[PDB]
Amino acid sequence: RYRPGTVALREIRRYQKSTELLIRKLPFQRLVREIAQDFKTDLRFQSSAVMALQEACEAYLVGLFEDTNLCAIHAKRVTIMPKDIQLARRIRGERA
Amino acid sequence: RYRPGTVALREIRRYQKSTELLIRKLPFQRLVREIAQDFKTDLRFQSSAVMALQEACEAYLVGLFEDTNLCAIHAKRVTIMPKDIQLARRIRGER
Amino acid sequence: RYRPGTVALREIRRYQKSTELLIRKLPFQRLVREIAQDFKTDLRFQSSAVMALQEACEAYLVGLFEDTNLCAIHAKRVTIMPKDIQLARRIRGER
Amino acid sequence: RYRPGTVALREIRRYQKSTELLIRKLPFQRLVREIAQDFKTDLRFQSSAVMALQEACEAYLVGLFEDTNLCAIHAKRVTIMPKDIQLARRIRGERA
Amino acid sequence: KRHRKVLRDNIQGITKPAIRRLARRGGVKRISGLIYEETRGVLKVFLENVIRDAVTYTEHAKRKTVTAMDVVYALKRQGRTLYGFGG
Amino acid sequence: KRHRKVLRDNIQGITKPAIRRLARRGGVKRISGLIYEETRGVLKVFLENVIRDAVTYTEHAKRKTVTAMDVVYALKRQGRTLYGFGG
Amino acid sequence: KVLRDNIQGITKPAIRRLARRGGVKRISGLIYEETRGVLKVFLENVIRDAVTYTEHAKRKTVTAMDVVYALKRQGRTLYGFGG
Amino acid sequence: ARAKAKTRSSRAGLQFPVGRVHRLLRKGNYSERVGAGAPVYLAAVLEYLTAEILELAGNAARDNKKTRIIPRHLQLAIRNDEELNKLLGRVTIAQGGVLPNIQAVLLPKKTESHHKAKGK
Amino acid sequence: LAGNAARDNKKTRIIPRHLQLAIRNDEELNKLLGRVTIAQGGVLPNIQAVLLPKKTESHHKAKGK
Amino acid sequence: RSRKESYSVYVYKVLKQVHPDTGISSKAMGIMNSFVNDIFERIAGEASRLAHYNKRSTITSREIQTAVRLLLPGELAKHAVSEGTKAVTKYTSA
Amino acid sequence: RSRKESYSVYVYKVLKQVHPDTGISSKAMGIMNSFVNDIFERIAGEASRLAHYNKRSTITSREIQTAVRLLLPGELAKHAVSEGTKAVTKYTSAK
DNA sequence: GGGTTAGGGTTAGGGTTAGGGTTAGGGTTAGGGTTAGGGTTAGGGTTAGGGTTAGGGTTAGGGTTAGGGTTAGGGTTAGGGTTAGGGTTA
DNA sequence: AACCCTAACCCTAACCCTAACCCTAACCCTAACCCTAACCCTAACCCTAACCCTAACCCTAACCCTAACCCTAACCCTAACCCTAACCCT
């Protein structure tokens, strides 16, 4: 058996050299519709609105994951921990 | 003979229960005057302005030190490192 | 008009000398159905079950209101306060 | 010029952090032996059993006193009255 | 289609002619300013930690209808037995 | 027979292998186990905030259709000037 | 404008009690230089903003109001001095 | 002839000035027109916020044996809240202090026991 | 949970006091053992805010000064 | 010398209404004065943009009521909205 | 037909001036349109506050020139200032 | 912007076992603290003198506004210059 | 860094009002500065007490090993879910 360590970098480069969507559209639309129903019923959604919402969520998730990885790799650990996300959110000032 | 571990907490509580200034006034005024002279000469300073500057600098330093300590204590280390300040500045988006 | 102090006692005696239901059935059934939907979907309800639920809720509400009134009337106050309900729940051990 | 009005708060922090028995281990056996003499004579109490009855009564009075203090603190009062003890026993279902 | 009233009773109905009528049976004479609001909230847990027991009981027997025979076993665990409607 | 509204399994819309390639775009190599729940909760909180802002905006405009312009304005008010959609 | 003896205005025992207010127990060695550099950069930014403001107002006296406005523009609404 | 009208704040049941906000909102180049009931809402909101802040400050000062509201009392009352700390999170108060927050790791959990000269 | 509280009291073992301090701390453990009574474990240090000294301070119903 | 606008009398009246035998200090007055002017330009500033986004230019009571739920959080927003509604009702009544 | 204002002709002319045989895409036009309107309300918005802080209400060329050094960084601010000065000089030289 | 009827092929979701990644135990030998001592260097009064701060008539050079003409500017419309995939060559 | 065969979107003209840029006179309204005098920034210094600087002794603390075992790493048959046109309306 060969040692892993190259397929991960290949997938990272392939997903970074492409600008394709990763999350689906209908599940996200149903989720935001269920969230909007908690405040006021009889609400609809468009296509560009949910597209901008998905783009903003993807950017926020990418930034949060990058911050978590940069916080975890500085403690002599190649993997991240569930507390690192809360640490990054406390430093950035998202939950106080 | 008292074992170490109690004088630090006592000093921390004493300095937290008081609202007195720690940095001097004349050195800070000379420093900000030298900084202002690098852009344009013939400049003066007031008292409330340098007081607000000292207060803002003290608040920023306190926040930075608190963030550095909170970042260092989460890595099984009671002390902080010089790279932790740069790490906190990179996370906060100051660089 | 009526002088305030006799219509209240008359209504109290009239409602105590009668054993009629005060809360509706369909709203309570819809409420317990919405509550059951939060745990598992595709759930139904019967008539005797919701009747026993309404009876237990009425008994609990009557007991809680009686305890609140008995706690408020002992502090030289004829009316009750919103904190008296929490006080009675803390004494009884309901949390 | 120091005794009238002091040590009222300088004595709570001691027993709240101590595990010793407040009621003393001497005056308690005669109070239990004389009570059981009326139900059925010719009885005896064990050494380890007289301590379990003392710890059970020393813990029940703490909760009753806490309930009395919570009931008295609601009527804008700082001291508990004999009318407050009977009030706390009527809601929990003790005497009525 | 479907009705727009998908609120499924947002803990309402029990208002002035209901809370006052229920308090008049116990012994409450007057009602202050607040009093309500939390009156509909203290009854939410009474149905949250009781109906869940009936659902969990019906899930054990591979059933789907909470009959009157299962609502008495849930109330007996808390300490409030009811006679008549149960059996 | 002919009704049904919405459920709650959509909350678990984030899988586990699909989120592995999502974090790989930023530079993450290995994740964990509780991340699938923590990230879901954080995303749910952020989406609730953004949806509440958009609902308040569409209520100011007295509209029932959440357009892309309102979402862009809410994101800019929060501190994320999104480009592309809208104007 | 003084000699380069004011940049080293932060000592070592005086900064120990300064970090103790936030909750720091032990520091290090290069902190006395890193914190000084960060403070110098931040002060250069704030001083540049105040100079641009006082140049807009055509004034040569850095008042507290201009400093408060610059801090609010950066993202730090300071209270107390000014209005 | 005619009558003597009173102030606008007495007819609305509030203490904050109504004409001051109506004149300050127009001179600030924010809007070319100011509504009639617009300054009343802002005045009521500001009055309620000030009342809540002063009540929290008094409640925080009543425990420090000081009847005078010092800036430290305001700093301790604002930071010790859930809905008020999120509003002024990035707002610093001069002549104040930091809330005492000591971590559990910095506590002296050394214990001279066990860690002794060898094992008895 | 009781082992972590023993290090704060400068102890290497779990005493019955630490058990009472750890059980009455968590919400999931206090609701389970509510009616459970511990022997030599003491109570939890809880002081009300109204029981604080001074409170009113200065004077309330004074006469001269 | 041109006097400066400051909120002192109203602040003292509010403090005396919510807490008797109390008062304000020296720097506390300036802190409250800087706090009032800060939120004054934040709530009124969002109403102008909200009116301009809908091709309008009338900032009435609804423009300020809706801006409460955007700046204020949850419970405080509902309390401020209720207070504003009761104030506008007492104003329109007499 | 109420057409919407968009910056397309000027953007295409600038792109053709700085790069021949080039053009804009589909979403790139909307991105540039949203970018222009974003900085349009940032530079002009600070000039109003800067004029109000000095008890004035005249936003001239100096009010926009000074706002460049506040929003733009260093080298870009000086370049924009030089371009604006050259433009106002060419404007004042001939109408 | 929703809502329909084919479809079908890329994507998502069931075992699996083996290899290196946290976790657990024992000095370890380098690494901060403090109390005893002393020699300061910053915390407070007295001035007083110049170097800035702070209001006020008065222009004339800086602006603001109602009217045209009009060069520059804004939606459509081709046919051609490299842009995406598929086998080759590398 | 095949660049090509595929190939539609970036592609140069052109074009019809055309709606905003410029013109042309009136005003009109928006900055110094010179008397001035008041109080705040700064300039020499004394003391003396908390504050600060400098060795010795040692008890915990971080790191480098040693074995160890359970979780996340990499196919395989799918076959369910995600696209891809094409109109059709309300």
UniProtKB/Swiss-Prot annotation, chains A, D:
Positions bearing Phosphoserine: S18, S47
N6,N6,N6-trimethyllysine, modified sites: K17, K40
Post-translational modification: Acetylation is generally linked to gene activation. Acetylation at Lys-83 (H3K122ac) by EP300/p300 plays a central role in chromatin structure: localizes at the surface of the histone octamer and stimulates transcription, possibly by promoting nucleosome instability.
N6-(beta-hydroxybutyryl)lysine carried by residues: K17, K40, K83
Modified residues (N6-crotonyllysine): K17
Modified residues (N6-acetyllysine): K17, K40, K76, K83
Residue numbers of Phosphothreonine PTMs: T41, T68
Residues found modified as Phosphotyrosine: Y2
Organism superkingdom: Eukaryota
Keyword check for Magnesium: no
N6-succinyllysine sites (modified residues): K17, K40, K83
Localization: Nucleus; Chromosome
Alphabetical GO biological process terms: chromatin organization; epigenetic regulation of gene expression; gene expression; nucleosome assembly; telomere organization
GO molecular function: cadherin binding; DNA binding; protein heterodimerization activity; structural constituent of chromatin
Entry-annotated residues carrying N6-lactoyllysine: K17, K40
Record keywords: Acetylation, ADP-ribosylation, Chromosome, Citrullination, Disease variant, DNA-binding, Hydroxylation, Lipoprotein, Methylation, Nucleosome core, Nucleus, Phosphoprotein, Ubl conjugation
Positions bearing N6-methyllysine: K17, K25, K40, K83
Quaternary data: The nucleosome is a histone octamer containing two molecules each of H2A, H2B, H3 and H4 assembled in one H3-H4 heterotetramer and two H2A-H2B heterodimers. The octamer wraps approximately 147 bp of DNA. Interacts with TONSL; CHAF1A; CHAF1B; MCM2 and DNAJC9. Interacts with NASP; NASP is a histone chaperone that stabilizes and maintains a soluble pool of Histone H3-H4 dimers.
Family recorded in the similarity comment: Belongs to the histone H3 family.
Designated name of the protein: Histone H3.1
Source species of the chain: Homo sapiens
Gene: H3C1
Swiss-Prot record, chains E, F:
PTM sites of type N6-methyllysine: K5
Effect of L22P: In TEBIVANED3; results in early developmental defects when expressed in zebrafish embryos
N6-(2-hydroxyisobutyryl)lysine modification, residue list: K1, K16, K29, K44, K62, K64, K76
Residues where N6-lactoyllysine is found: K1, K16, K62, K76
Covalent crosslink: Glycyl lysine isopeptide (Lys-Gly) (interchain with G-Cter in UFM1): K16
Role description: Core component of nucleosome. Nucleosomes wrap and compact DNA into chromatin, limiting DNA accessibility to the cellular machineries which require DNA as a template. Histones thereby play a central role in transcription regulation, DNA repair, DNA replication and chromosomal stability. DNA accessibility is regulated via a complex set of post-translational modifications of histones, also called histone code, and nucleosome remodeling.
Protein name per UniProt: Histone H4
UniProt lineage: Eukaryota, Metazoa, Chordata, Craniata, Vertebrata
Full protein stretch here: 17 to 103 of 103
Curated annotation (Swiss-Prot), chain H:
Compartment list: Nucleus; Chromosome
GO molecular function, one term: DNA binding
Compositionally biased residues, Basic residues: 1-9
Modification type N6-(beta-hydroxybutyryl)lysine: residues: K4, K27, K86, K109
Main location: nucleus
PTM-bearing positions, type Phosphothreonine: T111
Post-translational modification N6-succinyllysine, affected residues: K86
N5-methylglutamine: residues carrying this PTM: Q95
GO BP terms: chromatin organization; heterochromatin formation; negative regulation of cell population proliferation; protein localization to CENP-A containing chromatin
Residues found modified as N6-crotonyllysine: K27, K109, K110, K116
Positions where N6-(2-hydroxyisobutyryl)lysine occurs in the chain: K27, K65, K66, K86, K109
Gene Ontology CC annotations of this record: CENP-A containing nucleosome; extracellular exosome; nucleosome; nucleus
Posttranslational mods: Monoubiquitination of Lys-110 (H2AK119Ub) by RING1, TRIM37 and RNF2/RING2 complex gives a specific tag for epigenetic transcriptional repression and participates in X chromosome inactivation of female mammals. It is involved in the initiation of both imprinted and random X inactivation. Ubiquitinated H2A is enriched in inactive X chromosome chromatin. Ubiquitination of H2A functions downstream of methylation of 'Lys-27' of histone H3 (H3K27me). H2AK119Ub by RNF2/RING2 can also be induced by ultraviolet and may be involved in DNA repair. Phosphorylation at Thr-111 (H2AT120ph) by DCAF1 is present in the regulatory region of many tumor suppresor genes and down-regulates their transcription.
Glycyl lysine isopeptide (Lys-Gly) (interchain with G-Cter in ubiquitin) cross-link, chain position(s): K4, K6, K110
Statement: the UniProt record of this protein carries the keyword DNA-binding: yes
N6-glutaryllysine: residues carrying this PTM: K86, K109, K110, K116
InterPro entries recorded: Histone-fold, Histone_H2A, Histone_H2A/H2B/H3, Histone_H2A_C, Histone_H2A_CS
Pfam families tied to this protein: Histone (PF00125), Histone_H2A_C (PF16211)
Protein name: Histone H2A type 1-B/E
Gene designation: H2AC4
Swiss-Prot record, chain J:
Modified residues (N6-succinyllysine): K4, K86, K90
PTM: Monoubiquitination at Lys-4 (H2BK34Ub) by the MSL1/MSL2 dimer is required for histone H3 'Lys-4' (H3K4me) and 'Lys-79' (H3K79me) methylation and transcription activation at specific gene loci, such as HOXA9 and MEIS1 loci. Similarly, monoubiquitination at Lys-90 (H2BK120Ub) by the RNF20/40 complex gives a specific tag for epigenetic transcriptional activation and is also prerequisite for histone H3 'Lys-4' and 'Lys-79' methylation. It also functions cooperatively with the FACT dimer to stimulate elongation by RNA polymerase II. Phosphorylation at Ser-6 (H2BS36ph) by AMPK in response to stress promotes transcription.
Residue numbers carrying N6-malonyllysine: K86
Residues bearing the modification Phosphoserine: S6
List of residues that carry N6-methyllysine: K16, K78
GO molecular function, one term: protein heterodimerization activity
PolyADP-ribosyl glutamic acid modification, residue list: E5
N6,N6-dimethyllysine: modified positions: K27
Key words of the record: Acetylation, ADP-ribosylation, Antibiotic, Antimicrobial, Chromosome, DNA-binding, Glycoprotein, Hydroxylation, Isopeptide bond, Methylation, Nucleosome core, Nucleus, Phosphoprotein, Ubl conjugation
Modified residues (N6-(beta-hydroxybutyryl)lysine): K4, K55, K86, K90
Residues carrying a glycan: S82
Omega-N-methylarginine modification, residue list: R56, R62
UniProt modified residues of type N6-acetyllysine: K55
Residue numbers bearing the N6-glutaryllysine modification: K4, K13, K16, K78, K86, K90
A biological process term (GO) from this entry: antibacterial humoral response
UniProt modified residues of type N6-(2-hydroxyisobutyryl)lysine: K4, K13, K16, K27, K55, K78, K86, K90
Modification N6-lactoyllysine, positions: K13, K55, K78, K86, K90
A Gene Ontology term for the protein's cellular component: nucleosome
Phosphothreonine: residues carrying this PTM: T85
Modified residues (N6-crotonyllysine): K4
N6-methylated lysine: modified positions: K86
Similarity comment: Belongs to the histone H2B family.
Protein name per the record: Histone H2B type 1-K
Span within the parent record: 32 to 125 of 126
